[PDB]
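can u pls check wat happens w/ zinc ion
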Amino acid sequence: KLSLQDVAELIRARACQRVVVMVGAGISTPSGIPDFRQYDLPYPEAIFELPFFFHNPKPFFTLAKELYPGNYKPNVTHYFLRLLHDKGLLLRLYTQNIDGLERVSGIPASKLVEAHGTFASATCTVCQRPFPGEDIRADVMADRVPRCPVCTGVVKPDIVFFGEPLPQRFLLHVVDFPMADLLLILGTSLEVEPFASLTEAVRSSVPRLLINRDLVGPLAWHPRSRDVAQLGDVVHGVESLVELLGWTEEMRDLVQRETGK
Amino acid sequence: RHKK
Ligand SMILES: Oc1cc(O)cc(/C=C/c2ccc(Br)cc2)c1
Ligand SMILES: [Zn+2]
C-alpha cells in the first residue's frame, strides 16, 4: 500500500508525468470563500436555476459582483497546482469552482476545464450572442442587470446552471482520464455525477491521491490498491506534499512573485 | 448527455 511519500517520489522521478487534477470548494474556503449548505432566494439552488433567474436575476448578479476579480486571491493549494504546471507535470485541471482562482494563479486556460463555467465570458440568454465578461462588469458592478445591445435579452455570465450541458471542454475527459498517470483530487468528495465516476475512469495501475477533510466518495466506496488518502486540513496536506517533493523554496518564490508576500 |  502506497504512502504520500511514495507518490512524492514517483513525481520527483518522472514516473508521474501526466497529472490529472480534480478540485472543488475545499480549495477555495482557504481563500475566504464560504461553502454550500440571505440572498432573497426561495431555496439555495435557485441561484443557479434558469426559471428563477429569468423571474429574478438579482440574487445571481449579487453573487457575481462578490466573485468578480479583486475580492479573493488564490492560496497555497492553487499555487501548488500552478507549480505542477510550471514543472511540466499538469495534463489537466478539472474544477467545479466558479471563483476563477485557478486562472488567477496563472494556470493557462488550455490546462483548465472549468466544468461549472466561468465569469470571464457571458452569453445573451435569448439570441445567444457571446460577450466578454468585462463588457458586463460596469453594469454588474453598478447593480444593473446587463441587457443584450441587440435583442434586449438578459446577458448571463457563462456559469453553468442546473439542467444545462457541461461546457464543451468537458469532453476532454474522454481523452485525459485514460492518458493520466496520476490522479489528484483536492478539496472535494466528487459526490455529484459525472464527477464521481471520472474517478473510476483512470486505469487501475494509476495512483489516486486524495487530499481532503475526510475520506468520502468513490475512493471510500470503490477503493483500489494504489489509492492514498491524506486527510485533514487541505492546506496542511498540500504543504506536506510540497515538502516531500522538495518544492518549498519554489513555492515561496512563486507566492512572493504573484502576490507580493 | 452530461448536465449539471
Ligand atoms: O465549488 C464552488 C466554488 C465556488 O467558488 C463557489 C460555489 C458556489 C457558491 C454559492 C454561493 C451562494 C449560493 Br446561495 C450557492 C452557491 C461552489
Ligand atoms: Zn441578444
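DSSP finds no helices and no strands in chain B.
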